[model samples]
Target: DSIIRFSVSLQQNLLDELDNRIIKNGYSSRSELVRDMIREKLVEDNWNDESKIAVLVVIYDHHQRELNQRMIDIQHASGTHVLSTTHIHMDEHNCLETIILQGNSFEIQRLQLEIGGLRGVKFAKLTKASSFE
Candidate 1:
C-alpha cells in the first residue's frame, strides 16, 4: 500500500477532541489514529446477516439447575456452526464460557440472546471479526 495526502473536514471542537484522544491514548500521529478508525469501520461494515465469525461470551452461576445443559441445547438447535468452546472456571460459583460461532449473523446474535436470557447467565456479549486485510 502507498500513502497519499488528503484532508478531511470536521468541526474545530471535534478536531480538538481528536487531538486530545491522540495524546491520551499514545497515538503517534493523527494519521495513525485515522488509519485505525478507518480499519475498524471497514470491519464493522463488512458484517451482515450472512457468513461471519463471532465470539459469544457468557458468564453465569454454575449452580443454577441444569443451566449448562440448556445452553448446550440452544447451540445444538441453532443453525450457526460452533467452531470451538472454552470453559473457564472463575472461582467456584461462576463460570465463563467463550463460544466461537460462524454462520448467519442473525443466528449468531440469536444464540447469544438465548444464552443471555437464561436464568443463570449474568453477562453476555458478542464480539465480531472478519478478514479485513
Candidate 2:
C-alpha cells in the first residue's frame, strides 16, 4: 500500500474539536485518528451487508440456575461455528465470557441480542471484523 499526504479544510470549530479529541484519546497524530475513523466507517458499512462474519463478547452470571445451561444449548444448536470461548470468574455470582463466532452478520447479531438480553448478563459487546484480505 502507498501512503499519500493531502490537505483539506474544515470549519474552525470542528477542527478544534478534532484536536481536542486527539489529545483526549491519546492519539499520536491527527492522521492516525483519521485512518482509524475511516477503518471504523468501513466496518460499519460492512455490517450493512448480511453475509459478513463478526464476534460478540458477553458477560453474564454463571450461578443463574438454568442460564448457563440454556446458553450452552443455544450455542450448540446455533449452526454458527464457535471459533473460541473464554470465561473468567468476575466474582461469586458473576462471570465474564468472550465468544468469537464466524457466520452471517444477521445471525451473529441476533444471537448477541438474544444472549445479551438475558436477565443475569451484565455487559455485552459485539465487534465486527473485516474480510479485507
Candidate 3:
C-alpha cells in the first residue's frame, strides 16, 4: 500500500468536529478515519450502481399464516442471485432470517421490498455492501 500526502481546507468548527470524531472513534490519525470514510462512500456508490452485494435481515413471527411459504416462493422466483440464507429461532413465536444476495440493484431491491411488505414481518432492513474488488 502507498500513502499520499494532501491538504484539505475546512472551517474551524468542521475541523473541530472531525477531530472530536477521530478521538471518539479511537482512530489514531485523521488520515485513517478519512480513508475509512472514503471507502464507506465508495461502497454506497457501488450499491447505487447496476450490481452489487447486499444482506437482508428480517425478524418475523414464525406462526404467521402462509408467511413461510410466501417467503420461500419469492426467494425461489428471485432465481440464483440469492447466495445463501440463515434462519434462527428467536423465540417460541419469532424467527430471524438473514439473506445474502448478489445481483442487479433493481431485482435485489424489489425482492427486499416484497419480503419487507409481507404481513407478519416485525422488522426488515438491508445492509448494502460490496466485494471492494
Candidate 4:
C-alpha cells in the first residue's frame, strides 16, 4: 500500500497545546510527532500483552544490611527469567546492578516495584523493552 492523506480537526486550544509540545520536543514536523506518538502508544500496549523483556538498573547503598540476599531472594522467587545480572562498583558507597529479565510485563513490573521498594536501593529504574515495533 501507499501513503494516504487524512485530516484531524480539533479545537484551537487543543491544537495550540499540541504545537507547543512539538516545539518543546523539537519534532521536525506534525506528521513526525504524530507518528512517534502512535508508536509510543503501541509500545505501551505491547507491555500489557503477556510477554516482554526488560532491563532493571538499580543503584544501592553498599553498606545496607542483608540487602544483597533479599534482592537475590526476590529475583529468584518472581518466576521471571533472569538472563544475566551485571554488577558495577559505582563508588565506595554505591553499587549498581543491571539486571536483564524476560517474562510477562506484569511480572517484570512487579519485580521492578519490589526491588525498588528495598530500603537500600537508592534508585531502581526499569527500561521497558519489546519486539513490537
Candidate 5:
C-alpha cells in the first residue's frame, strides 16, 4: 500500500486528549488510530444507507410468560431479513440471543425496538455489521 502524509492542527488541549486516547486504546501511532476512526465512520455511513446488515444481541429471562414465543414470533414476522439466530442458555433463567439481519435499516431498527421493549428483556444492543466490499 502507498502512504501519503498530512498534518492536522488542533488546540493544545485537544491534542493532549488525542494522545491520551491513543495510549489508552493501545494504538501504536496517531495515524493508526486515525485510520481506524475513518473506517468506523465509513461503516456507520453504510449503516445509514439502504440494505445494510446488523446484529441484534438480547438477554432476557427465560421464565417470563410467553417471552420466548413472542421473540420467535417477531423473528418469524421479520421474514427474509432475519438471516439467522442463535439462542444460548446463559444460565438457569437467563437466555441470550444473537440475531443476524440484513435489509432496510428502518426495518432492522424496528425489529430491535420491538424486542427490546418486551417485558423480560434485561439487555439489548444492536451492532451495525458491514463489509468494505
Candidate 6:
C-alpha cells in the first residue's frame, strides 16, 4: 500500500500528550500511532454492530461437578461455530480456556455470557475482530 503525508491540527495540550506517548511507547512517528488509533476505532465500530465477527473467551474451574461437560454441551449447542479452543490447566482448581468462535455478534456475546454464568466460572471476556480491510 502507498502511504501519504498529511498534517493534522490539535490542541497544544493534546499534542504534548501525544508526543509523550510517542516517546514513552517508542513509536517511530505520530503517523504510526494515529494509524493504530484509526484501526482500533474501526474494530470497535464493527464490534458495536450486532452482526460482526468476534472471539469469545471464558476462564473457569474445570473441577466443578459436571462443569467441564456442561461447558462442552453449551459450546456444542450454542449454534455458533467453535473455530478453536485451548484449555490451560492452571494448577488443580482453575483452568483457563480460550474459545475462538464465529457467529452474529449478539449470539457470540450471548454465548460468552451463558458460559461465564456457570457456577464455577471465574473470568469471562469477549475479544472482537473484523475483516473490514
* Winning candidate number (lDDT): 4
Between prediction 5 and prediction 6, which has the larger lDDT? 5
What C-alpha lDDT values do all the predictions have?
0.85, 0.77, 0.82, 0.85, 0.81, 0.79
Please, what is the TM-score per model?
Answer: 0.61, 0.57, 0.58, 0.62, 0.58, 0.58
Clashing pairs in 1: none
How big is the positional error of residue 10 in model 5, measured in Å on the Cα after superposition?
38
The parts of candidate 1 lying over 4 Å away from their true place are: 1-49, 131-133
lDDT per residue as tens, model 5, 26-59: 9999889888888897776445445777889999
User: Tell me, what's the RMSD of every candidate?
Assistant: 9.4, 9.6, 9.9, 9.4, 9.5, 10.4
Top candidate by TM-score:
4
Candidate 5: C-alpha RMSD after superposition:
9.5
Summarize candidate 6's per-residue lDDT along 12-108 as a digit string, tens digits.
9989999999999999999999999988977774454435556666777776899888877987777777778888888798788887777776677
RMSD of 4: 9.4
**Candidate 2 per-residue lDDT over residues 21-125, each given as its tens digit:** 999989999899988998997767545534555677777778787988778777666656687889988788878888877767667767777787778877888
Better of 1 and 4 by lDDT: 4
Question: What is candidate 1's lDDT per residue for 1-133, written digit by digit as tens?
Answer: 7888699999899899999999999999999999899999777743545588888889999888999899889988888888899999996988999988887867877898898888989899888775221
User: Which pairs of residues have clashing backbones in candidate 3?
Assistant: none
2 or 3, greater by lDDT = 3
Better of 1 and 3 by TM-score: 1
The digit string of per-residue lDDT tens for model 3 on 1-133 reads 7987899888899899999999998999988888899999777644544567889899999988899899888877864277788999989989999988887667776788888889998788878787422
The sequence of per-residue lDDT tens digits that candidate 4 reaches over residues 10-47 is 88988898899999988888888888888897776434
